[PDB]
Write a structure and sequence with these properties.
heterodimer, A: 583 residues, alpha/beta, Rossmann fold, 4 domains, five-stranded parallel beta sheet, 28% helix, B: 571 residues, Spore Coat Polysaccharide Biosynthesis Protein SpsA, Chain A, three-stranded parallel beta sheet, 18 helices, 15% strand, elongated, binds a molecule of 3 linked components (NAG-NAG-BMA), binds uridine-5'-diphosphate, binds 2-acetamido-2-deoxy-beta-D-glucopyranose, binds manganese (II) ion, manganese (chain A)
């Protein structure tokens, strides 16, 4: 009854497996006999490189097939044949009780329907182009339709380098695609010449899509083809304010991600398209949703949008691109986090976490479902940062004088001393003895007066998201060796602050403990250093902002930074040249 | 048709676009008092309209809220006889008890092949995600008794379940939990609630517990939820597959706890994990939800129409904060518009705006000194002096950056804050005529600091405010600088969006008063920046002004300024 197409979590899912242990996902072993596409390989590597990967099927409560399923078009070069009996032969399939299926294309030329090919049964499908008429509200996940050139890790860092008021540029609505003479899904693009005006709204289409370039051309191909020139598409998305993303052969398109990257507010025309991550993302803040039936009056509606709303839409679009759509790893982690939050109804991210900086991928509800326990949403609420902090000292005498000085601080609620398993990076573990949100990590070799502690705390009061610390080190790029460097003497700028004398949030401790993979922690422990470097990397990545400075061992730093950058995919560190001092 | 959504089963041609982005609803002229007052609430709302050929939504005058006496065949005949059914493409129906004595279908049993349904008891299978709206089930107790507005705090009971005629399994599990813990869980039995040798009044007993339990006994939706929200206790819904009312726009994760019916014996342990701060937050959210959406039928109708209008007009939809923020935190909210954390590069610079009046020897020194700094994209001179004429073109200083002189129709001090379309940068330096004691490297470092904080003021002068107990009013202080809360606009880097805000989005008549009094413009700019961005200022190195500060604080209703003790200097 409810176990067919109308599958939900209360019927087509086994919560018993997920209740036994943590939320883990299991990848089927590769058969070493079938072709695997680059996109599916990237997805599988993102799953395996994530913290939810486990090798034991019994422990995991979620499964993902290693057989390629992104390309389900019978004429596609990446299609895998005879999947109907191939999927059924798996011993662990179990009719897809807890199976997640990734997909990007479905259907054939006559009709691009939900032709998944093999009978999924009760499995959940993370198909990209899902119509709202066949989308399960709390079972399926909609993902963006990425291309084969989408970066595995890292990103393009957006395009919007200047926030110029007014946001309006030398264009209003642009489009440069390819119309289709025959088929399904070309009605919206064949009528764009009604909307087209040239001066500000320019819509361009081409009817040369194969054999029909001169065979079945109508009396308007020639006019469109001549005007389809002298206007680069990339060189158009940079001067445009609104990007039109209509429906073609399939509801989704690569144009959506390009519009998100180019900071132009998308204006979707694909009617009944379940937007990517629609169950957690409010697309009314980062996009303008429109209906293709009212195609004629679209430019009037676009002009009716106010200036401040346009600015907010552009900024939210850039945030969404930098948070959830930059890389395929981010997409996979977003889907996995949505599925994980779908399990515990009392431990889940609310609608504000996903749609606000930094986003759901960096905010873990398992730490707390209350927004006041995070340093990110103080301004959104009527709350102020806590007035007390718990100092943390990791000891492996100056320490005797240091503890007295730190205790004299008025805002110091308590002091925790760590003595060493001699894991020097274990000081970032979350401890139940910590009550206040702010945490001061202190080294026994650090000399710090109580007035300086008070100044650091009062500075952190204005910046609860960043790290405020006295020691600062920067990073440089070495052209000769093509690897990132590390300098710690007389640096003009800085991009990192050592945790030994820095103030930050205990949620950063929790995120370091429960977010970064075990491989980086193992490398840090084996090298017996490079833990503050990883903490600064995580904080720069989550905040997108540099820290704040207030007033053989060296060679290992370069290898540490290279490994961290390789895992992250880019360099989250941002140079800073300012130094906050008391007045 | 359960399969279709708004994209196919709804007609948008009737309501294409209007300058006032408001949906148009009509009520057919043909009922319980509930439906009568719902129709009255629809009538006196902004969504009401005439001229049927110009309207979009239709609301029939049919009693459909209660299904006990629904007469499904009669309802189908009425829907056919509406004379504007048109397959029911744009007809909205209100319901709160969509259950049947033989079986609780969790949906309305009328044909409604294409109609729009607003039910109270909605399951995940019978609810159209993008089409239907889940509305609260009305309880007359909300308006019949006016409970006191008791603030959040400790209560004698931790868990409470006051329902009548529950299934024996739920009652047995509740009794097991009560005997397992005791003195905190209080289960009540049969307006009057009875315990073992104890009698409690149903409306007021809920005020004595912080968590109230709601169970699925019939229709998947119980009116006890409204009473739970009214009394301030956090609802604990145990219905396995039930979508909470107004879940599309409201954030129920911050107001209610959903525990599956399978883990009914584990409810207490789940509720224990929630800290007290979140408990108070959820109590406030529940009270706000009751007083805004559950208190009155007019509230239900307005919320439903607002949700539908947001669906029809996403570009004009109200914000999440507007939907689900209590008025106190809405007053305390910030909602910074320059929330995107980007660092602009050095390719674009800043446009220096110089305000001069009856002085030309200081103007030339200012221009010469500013021209020494790098990254000076443009330099604009504002000539407020109407009687005097600008100097000849030859006499202007020789610089390599584009210099232009602005012609001012009038002489108002707020001419430095007008957003000029000739400015091509986002940073706008505002150095006045007398500011000549600044070096080039100082301005360059100020612009460097501003690049890291583009959403807040970066200025060299440092001033602050203070509170005087003798006069019970705000004062001004500048002699001693231990903390900084204000930055004078003279030689102060800020976003031109701040210029736009000062010119156009200013509360009441603040600007009309600065111009009249020809003073206190930096004060107004600081107040506006603090109120809009919710962030302090960055500093880089009398009676009239006090009245200015007091008037600005009175207009805002509070003090948007923040006190900080940090300044930026080169490393
Ligand atoms: C930024 O400025 C706005 C004003 O445009 C501030 O909103 C105002 O906040 C005050 C209290 O903070 C509100 O006063 C309240 O009025 C209600 C009656 O409506 C009264 O019952 C309360 O006791 C209180 O006096 C005022 O209404 C409100 N203005 C508007 C238009 O809602 C806002 O608080 C400022 N933000 C910051 C961070 O300073
Ligand atoms: O001048 C153009 C036109 C299209 N495209 C690419 O083509 C895709 C969208 O256009 P197309 O008409 O091919 O989409 P379709 O309608 O075929 O799905 C995207 O990947 C664009 O980057 C492009 O790069 N330049
Ligand atoms: O009608 C007027 C009056 C004043 N100002 C400007 O207001 C400032 C007043 O100068 P100053 O800051 O020295 O005054 P103070 O507060 O120091 O007495 C200068 O920039 C003037 O150009 C102006 O533009 N028009
Ligand atoms: C669009 O912006 C780019 C800057 O990236 C600029 O080079 C280009 O000239 C602009 N296009 C037009 C038509 O001016
Ligand atoms: Mn002066």
């Amino acid at each position: 009854i409810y176990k067919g197409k109308k599958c939900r979590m209360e019927s087509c899912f086994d919560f018993t497996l997920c209740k036994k242990n943590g939320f883990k996902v299991y990848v089927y072993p590769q058969q070493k006999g079938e072709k695997i596409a680059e996109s599916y390989q990237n997805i599988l590597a993102a799953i395996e490189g994530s913290r939810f990967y486990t090798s034991d099927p019994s422990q995991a409560c979620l499964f993902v097939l290693s057989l390629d399923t992104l390309d389900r078009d019978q004429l596609s070069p990446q299609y895998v044949h005879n999947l109907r009996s191939k999927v059924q032969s798996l011993h662990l399939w179990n009719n897809g009780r807890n199976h997640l299926i990734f997909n990007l294309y479905s259907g054939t030329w006559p009709d691009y329907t939900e032709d998944v090919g093999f009978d999924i049964g009760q499995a959940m499908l993370a198909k990209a182009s899902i119509s709202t008429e066949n989308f399960r509200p709390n079972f399926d996940v909609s993902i963006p339709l990425f291309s084969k050139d989408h970066p595995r890790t890292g990103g393009e860092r957006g395009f919007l380098k200047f926030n110029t008021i007014p946001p309006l540029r030398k264009y209003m609505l642009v489009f440069k695609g390819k119309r289709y003479l025959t088929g399904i899904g070309s009605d919206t693009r064949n009528a764009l010449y009604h909307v087209h005006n040239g001066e500000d709204v320019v819509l361009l289409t081409t009817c040369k899509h194969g054999k029909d370039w001169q065979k079945h051309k109508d009396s308007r191909c020639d006019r469109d083809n001549t005007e389809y020139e002298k206007y680069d598409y990339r060189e158009m998305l940079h001067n445009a304010t609104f990007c039109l993303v209509p429906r073609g052969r399939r509801l989704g398109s690569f144009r959506f991600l390009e519009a998100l990257q180019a900071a132009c507010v998308p204006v979707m025309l694909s009617n009944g398209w379940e937007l990517p991550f629609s169950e957690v993302i409010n697309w009314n803040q980062a996009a303008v949703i429109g209906d293709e039936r009212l195609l004629l009056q679209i430019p009037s509606t676009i002009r009716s949008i106010h200036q401040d709303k346009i600015l907010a839409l552009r900024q939210q679009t850039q945030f969404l691109w930098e948070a959830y759509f930059s890389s395929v790893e981010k997409i996979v982690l977003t889907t996995l986090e949505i599925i994980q939050d779908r399990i515990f109804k009392h431990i889940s991210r609310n609608s504000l976490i996903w749609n606000k900086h930094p986003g759901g991928l960096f905010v873990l509800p398992q730490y707390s479902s209350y927004l006041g326990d995070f340093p990110y949403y103080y301004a959104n609420l009527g709350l102020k940062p806590p007035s007390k902090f718990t100092a943390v000292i990791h000891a492996v005498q100056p320490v005797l004088k240091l503890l007295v000085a730190a205790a004299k601080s008025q805002y110091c609620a308590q002091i925790i001393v760590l003595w060493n398993s001699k894991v020097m990076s274990s000081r970032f573990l979350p401890y139940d003895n910590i009550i206040t949100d702010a945490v001061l990590s202190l080294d026994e070799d650090t000399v710090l007066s109580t007035t300086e502690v008070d100044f650091a705390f009062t500075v952190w009061q204005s910046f609860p998201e960043r790290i405020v610390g006295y020691p600062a080190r920067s990073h440089f790029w070495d052209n000769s060796k093509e690897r990132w460097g590390y300098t710690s003497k007389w640096t003009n700028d800085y991009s990192m602050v050592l945790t030994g004398a820095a103030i930050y949030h205990k949620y950063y401790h929790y995120l370091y403990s429960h977010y970064l993979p075990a491989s980086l922690k193992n490398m840090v422990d084996q090298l017996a250093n490079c833990e503050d470097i990883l903490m600064n990397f995580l904080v720069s990545a989550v905040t997108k902002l540099p820290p704040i400075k207030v007033t053989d061992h060296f060679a290992q730093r370069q290898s540490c930074m290279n490994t961290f950058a390789s895992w992250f995919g880019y360099m989250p560190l941002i140079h800073s040249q300012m130094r906050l001092d008391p007045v | 048709d359960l399969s279709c959504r708004m994209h196919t089963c709804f007609d948008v041609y009737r309501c294409g676009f209007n300058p006032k982005n408001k949906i148009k609803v009509y009520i057919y002229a043909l009922i319980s008092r509930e439906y009568n007052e719902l129709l009255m609430a629809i009538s006196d709302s902004d969504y009401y309209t005439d001229d049927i050929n110009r309207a979009c939504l239709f609301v029939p005058s049919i009693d459909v809220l209660n299904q006990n006496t629904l007469r499904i065949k009669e309802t189908a005949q009425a829907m056919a006889q509406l004379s504007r059914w048109d397959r029911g493409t744009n007809h909205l129906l209100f319901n709160m008890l969509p259950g049947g004595p033989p079986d609780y279908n969790t949906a309305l049993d009328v044909p409604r092949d294409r109609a729009l349904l607003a039910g109270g008891g909605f399951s995940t299978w019978t609810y159209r995600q993008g089409y239907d709206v889940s509305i609260p089930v009305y309880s007359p107790l909300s308006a019949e008794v006016d409970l006191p507005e008791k603030g959040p705090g400790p209560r004698q009971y931790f868990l409470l379940s006051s329902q009548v005629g529950l299934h024996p399994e739920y009652r047995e599990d509740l009794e097991a939990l009560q005997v397992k813990h005791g003195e905190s869980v209080l289960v009540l039995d049969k307006r009057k609630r009875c315990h073992k040798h104890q009698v409690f009044d149903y409306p007021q007993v809920l005020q004595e517990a912080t968590f109230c339990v709601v169970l699925r006994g019939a229709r998947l939706g119980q009116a006890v939820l409204s009473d739970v929200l009214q009394a301030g206790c956090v609802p604990v819904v145990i219905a396995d597959s039930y979508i909470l009312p107004f879940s599309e726009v409201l954030d129920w994760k911050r107001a209610s706890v959903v525990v599956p019916e399978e883990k009914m014996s584990d409810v207490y342990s789940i509720l224990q994990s929630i800290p007290q701060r979140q408990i108070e937050e959820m109590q406030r959210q529940a009270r706000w939800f009751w007083e805004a959406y559950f208190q009155s039928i007019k509230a239900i109708a307005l919320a439903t129409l607002q949700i539908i209008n947001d669906r029809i007009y996403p570009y004009a939809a109200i914000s999440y904060e507007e939907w689900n923020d209590p008025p106190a935190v809405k007053w305390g909210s910030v909602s910074n518009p320059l929330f995107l954390p980007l660092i602009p590069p050095q390719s674009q610079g800043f446009t220096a705006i110089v305000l001069t009046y009856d002085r030309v020897e200081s103007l030339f020194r200012v221009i010469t000194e500013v021209s020494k700094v790098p990254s000076l994209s443009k330099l604009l001179v504002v000539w407020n002096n109407q009687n005097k004429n600008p100097p000849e073109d030859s006499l202007w200083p020789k610089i390599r950056v584009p210099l232009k002189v602005v012609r001012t129709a009038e002489n108002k001090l707020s001419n430095r804050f007008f957003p000029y379309d000739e400015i091509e940068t986002e940073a706008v330096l505002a150095i006045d005529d007398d500011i000549i004691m600044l070096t080039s490297d100082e301005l360059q470092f100020g612009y460097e600091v501003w690049r890291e904080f583009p959403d807040r003021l970066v200025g060299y002068p440092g001033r602050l405010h203070l509170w005087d107990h003798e006069m019970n009013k705000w004062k001004y202080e500048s002699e001693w600088t231990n903390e900084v809360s204000m930055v004078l606009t003279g030689a102060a880097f800020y976003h031109k969006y701040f210029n736009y805000l000062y010119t156009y989005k200013m509360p009441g008549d603040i600007k009309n008063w600065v111009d009249a009094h020809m003073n206190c413009e930096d004060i107004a700019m600081n107040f506006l920046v603090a109120n809009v961005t919710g962030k302090a200022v960055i500093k880089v190195t009398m009676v009239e002004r006090s009245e200015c500060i007091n008037k600005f604080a009175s207009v805002f209703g509070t003090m948007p300024l923040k006190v900080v003790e940090h300044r930026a200097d080169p490393v």
